[PDB]
Enzyme design. Structure first.
Site, PDB file in Angstrom:
ATOM      1  N   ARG A  62      36.257  -4.724 106.885  1.00  0.00           N
ATOM      2  CA  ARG A  62      37.197  -5.859 106.828  1.00  0.00           C
ATOM      3  C   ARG A  62      37.446  -6.336 108.243  1.00  0.00           C
ATOM      4  O   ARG A  62      37.840  -5.553 109.109  1.00  0.00           O
ATOM      5  CB  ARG A  62      38.501  -5.402 106.133  1.00  0.00           C
ATOM      6  CG  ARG A  62      39.796  -6.251 106.118  1.00  0.00           C
ATOM      7  CD  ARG A  62      39.665  -7.698 105.676  1.00  0.00           C
ATOM      8  NE  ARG A  62      39.699  -8.706 106.764  1.00  0.00           N
ATOM      9  CZ  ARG A  62      39.644 -10.025 106.570  1.00  0.00           C
ATOM     10  NH1 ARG A  62      39.537 -10.517 105.339  1.00  0.00           N
ATOM     11  NH2 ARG A  62      39.673 -10.859 107.602  1.00  0.00           N
TER      12      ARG A  62
ATOM     13  N   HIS B 228      24.403  -8.544  93.372  1.00  0.00           N
ATOM     14  CA  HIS B 228      25.626  -8.887  94.117  1.00  0.00           C
ATOM     15  C   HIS B 228      26.640  -7.768  93.916  1.00  0.00           C
ATOM     16  O   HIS B 228      26.725  -7.174  92.851  1.00  0.00           O
ATOM     17  CB  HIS B 228      26.265 -10.251  93.705  1.00  0.00           C
ATOM     18  CG  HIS B 228      25.350 -11.439  93.811  1.00  0.00           C
ATOM     19  ND1 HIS B 228      25.170 -12.154  94.979  1.00  0.00           N
ATOM     20  CD2 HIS B 228      24.600 -12.067  92.874  1.00  0.00           C
ATOM     21  CE1 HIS B 228      24.319 -13.143  94.765  1.00  0.00           C
ATOM     22  NE2 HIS B 228      23.954 -13.111  93.494  1.00  0.00           N
ATOM     23  N   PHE B 229      27.398  -7.481  94.970  1.00  0.00           N
ATOM     24  CA  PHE B 229      28.529  -6.574  94.896  1.00  0.00           C
ATOM     25  C   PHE B 229      29.774  -7.360  94.521  1.00  0.00           C
ATOM     26  O   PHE B 229      30.215  -8.251  95.273  1.00  0.00           O
ATOM     27  CB  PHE B 229      28.759  -5.894  96.214  1.00  0.00           C
ATOM     28  CG  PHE B 229      29.727  -4.776  96.129  1.00  0.00           C
ATOM     29  CD1 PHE B 229      31.108  -5.011  96.255  1.00  0.00           C
ATOM     30  CD2 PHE B 229      29.284  -3.481  95.889  1.00  0.00           C
ATOM     31  CE1 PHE B 229      32.016  -3.969  96.155  1.00  0.00           C
ATOM     32  CE2 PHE B 229      30.190  -2.434  95.808  1.00  0.00           C
ATOM     33  CZ  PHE B 229      31.558  -2.678  95.943  1.00  0.00           C
ATOM     34  N   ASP B 230      30.336  -7.046  93.359  1.00  0.00           N
ATOM     35  CA  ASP B 230      31.482  -7.795  92.868  1.00  0.00           C
ATOM     36  C   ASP B 230      32.794  -7.219  93.377  1.00  0.00           C
ATOM     37  O   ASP B 230      33.625  -7.964  93.884  1.00  0.00           O
ATOM     38  CB  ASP B 230      31.484  -7.836  91.338  1.00  0.00           C
ATOM     39  CG  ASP B 230      32.319  -8.963  90.794  1.00  0.00           C
ATOM     40  OD1 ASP B 230      32.110 -10.125  91.193  1.00  0.00           O
ATOM     41  OD2 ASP B 230      33.203  -8.689  89.965  1.00  0.00           O
TER      42      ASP B 230
ATOM     43  N   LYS C 260      18.223  -8.541  99.430  1.00  0.00           N
ATOM     44  CA  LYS C 260      19.472  -8.941 100.064  1.00  0.00           C
ATOM     45  C   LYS C 260      20.610  -7.945  99.721  1.00  0.00           C
ATOM     46  O   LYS C 260      21.375  -7.559 100.591  1.00  0.00           O
ATOM     47  CB  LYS C 260      19.811 -10.377  99.646  1.00  0.00           C
ATOM     48  CG  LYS C 260      20.998 -11.028 100.337  1.00  0.00           C
ATOM     49  CD  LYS C 260      21.302 -12.364  99.616  1.00  0.00           C
ATOM     50  CE  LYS C 260      22.657 -12.935 100.021  1.00  0.00           C
ATOM     51  NZ  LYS C 260      23.208 -13.897  99.021  1.00  0.00           N
TER      52      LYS C 260
ATOM     53  N   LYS D  13      31.084 -12.323 108.498  1.00  0.00           N
ATOM     54  CA  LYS D  13      31.391 -12.149 107.076  1.00  0.00           C
ATOM     55  C   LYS D  13      32.702 -11.363 106.984  1.00  0.00           C
ATOM     56  O   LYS D  13      32.745 -10.232 107.467  1.00  0.00           O
ATOM     57  CB  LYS D  13      30.275 -11.411 106.329  1.00  0.00           C
ATOM     58  CG  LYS D  13      30.493 -11.414 104.828  1.00  0.00           C
ATOM     59  CD  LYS D  13      29.348 -10.776 104.049  1.00  0.00           C
ATOM     60  CE  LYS D  13      29.496 -11.102 102.568  1.00  0.00           C
ATOM     61  NZ  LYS D  13      28.693 -10.211 101.683  1.00  0.00           N
ATOM     62  N   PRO D  14      33.770 -11.965 106.411  1.00  0.00           N
ATOM     63  CA  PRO D  14      35.128 -11.371 106.370  1.00  0.00           C
ATOM     64  C   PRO D  14      35.246  -9.974 105.769  1.00  0.00           C
ATOM     65  O   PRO D  14      35.774  -9.081 106.423  1.00  0.00           O
ATOM     66  CB  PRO D  14      35.920 -12.350 105.497  1.00  0.00           C
ATOM     67  CG  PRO D  14      35.209 -13.634 105.637  1.00  0.00           C
ATOM     68  CD  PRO D  14      33.761 -13.309 105.805  1.00  0.00           C
ATOM     69  N   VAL D  15      34.755  -9.792 104.540  1.00  0.00           N
ATOM     70  CA  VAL D  15      34.734  -8.488 103.899  1.00  0.00           C
ATOM     71  C   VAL D  15      33.299  -8.148 103.427  1.00  0.00           C
ATOM     72  O   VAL D  15      32.559  -9.005 102.915  1.00  0.00           O
ATOM     73  CB  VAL D  15      35.768  -8.384 102.745  1.00  0.00           C
ATOM     74  CG1 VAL D  15      37.023  -9.190 103.054  1.00  0.00           C
ATOM     75  CG2 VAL D  15      35.205  -8.873 101.414  1.00  0.00           C
TER      76      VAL D  15
ATOM     77  N   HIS E 210      24.566  -4.087 101.287  1.00  0.00           N
ATOM     78  CA  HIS E 210      25.422  -3.119 100.579  1.00  0.00           C
ATOM     79  C   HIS E 210      24.929  -1.680 100.487  1.00  0.00           C
ATOM     80  O   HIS E 210      25.715  -0.796 100.161  1.00  0.00           O
ATOM     81  CB  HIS E 210      25.680  -3.633  99.164  1.00  0.00           C
ATOM     82  CG  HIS E 210      26.314  -4.978  99.131  1.00  0.00           C
ATOM     83  ND1 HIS E 210      27.607  -5.185  99.551  1.00  0.00           N
ATOM     84  CD2 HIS E 210      25.837  -6.191  98.774  1.00  0.00           C
ATOM     85  CE1 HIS E 210      27.903  -6.470  99.449  1.00  0.00           C
ATOM     86  NE2 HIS E 210      26.844  -7.099  98.982  1.00  0.00           N
TER      87      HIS E 210
ATOM     88  N   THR F 124      31.144  -4.371 101.680  1.00  0.00           N
ATOM     89  CA  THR F 124      31.174  -2.978 101.270  1.00  0.00           C
ATOM     90  C   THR F 124      29.773  -2.381 101.314  1.00  0.00           C
ATOM     91  O   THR F 124      28.829  -3.014 100.880  1.00  0.00           O
ATOM     92  CB  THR F 124      31.753  -2.858  99.854  1.00  0.00           C
ATOM     93  OG1 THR F 124      33.090  -3.359  99.867  1.00  0.00           O
ATOM     94  CG2 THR F 124      31.783  -1.426  99.389  1.00  0.00           C
TER      95      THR F 124
ATOM     96  N   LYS G   2      33.938 -11.443  88.647  1.00  0.00           N
ATOM     97  CA  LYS G   2      34.954 -12.318  89.233  1.00  0.00           C
ATOM     98  C   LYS G   2      34.751 -13.795  88.968  1.00  0.00           C
ATOM     99  O   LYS G   2      35.712 -14.514  88.808  1.00  0.00           O
ATOM    100  CB  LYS G   2      35.062 -12.099  90.751  1.00  0.00           C
ATOM    101  CG  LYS G   2      36.022 -10.990  91.066  1.00  0.00           C
ATOM    102  CD  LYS G   2      35.795 -10.335  92.414  1.00  0.00           C
ATOM    103  CE  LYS G   2      36.670  -9.089  92.504  1.00  0.00           C
ATOM    104  NZ  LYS G   2      36.667  -8.444  93.866  1.00  0.00           N
TER     105      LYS G   2
HETATM  106 IR   LIG Z   1      26.998  -9.824  99.240  1.00  0.00          IR
HETATM  107 IR   LIG Z   2      23.809 -14.300  91.588  1.00  0.00          IR
END
Ligand SMILES: [Ir+4]
Ligand SMILES: [Ir+4]
Ligand SMILES: [Cl-]
Ligand SMILES: [Cl-]
Ligand SMILES: [Ir+4]
Ligand SMILES: [Ir+4]
Ligand SMILES: [Ir+4]
Ligand SMILES: [O]
EC number: 4.6.1.18
Length: 124
Positions: free
Chosen positions: A85, A119-121, A7, A41-43, A12, A45, A66
């Protein structure tokens, strides 16, 4: 089921191009990577580095995620990225995005064995 690690690559990872080539980019890539399916999906990267460079971040600067967890890692160097975005006028299902190239440090959450990005933080 899709693993968290796969995923992350889908959502990403774009190693193929070194820097955006936009303004199309976010509109086609959000779409093509299945990020305009349920919602817009709003944002999001994309990272323009080798998978190996991005995976390596999991053994770099340990920082707070976060969400308050401790399994986040900041890249010691900046990386070529593209922030997608959603626009003010974007309406599902025709999701519309602004493409912005930058060179920034990435922050990713890592887990599993092997210990890889899931996950991209943030970027900083
Ligand atoms: Ir994600
Ligand atoms: Ir997680
Ligand atoms: Cl499957
Ligand atoms: Cl910097
Ligand atoms: Ir499956
Ligand atoms: Ir693409
Ligand atoms: Ir820096
Ligand atoms: O940096």
């Amino acid at each position: 089921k899709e693993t968290a690690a796969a995923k992350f690559e889908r959502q990403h990872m774009d190693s193929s191009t070194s820097a955006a080539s936009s303004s199309n980019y976010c509109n086609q890539m959000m779409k093509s990577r299945n990020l305009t399916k349920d919602r817009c999906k709003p944002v999001n990267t994309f990272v323009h580095e080798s998978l190996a460079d991005v995976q390596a971040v999991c053994s770099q600067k340990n920082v707070a995620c976060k969400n308050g967890q401790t399994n986040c890692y900041q890249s010691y160097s900046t990386m070529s990225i593209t922030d997608c975005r959603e626009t003010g006028s974007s309406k599902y299902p025709n999701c519309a995005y602004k493409t912005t190239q930058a060179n920034k440090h990435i922050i990713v959450a890592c887990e599993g064995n092997p210990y890889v990005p899931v996950h991209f933080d943030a970027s900083v």
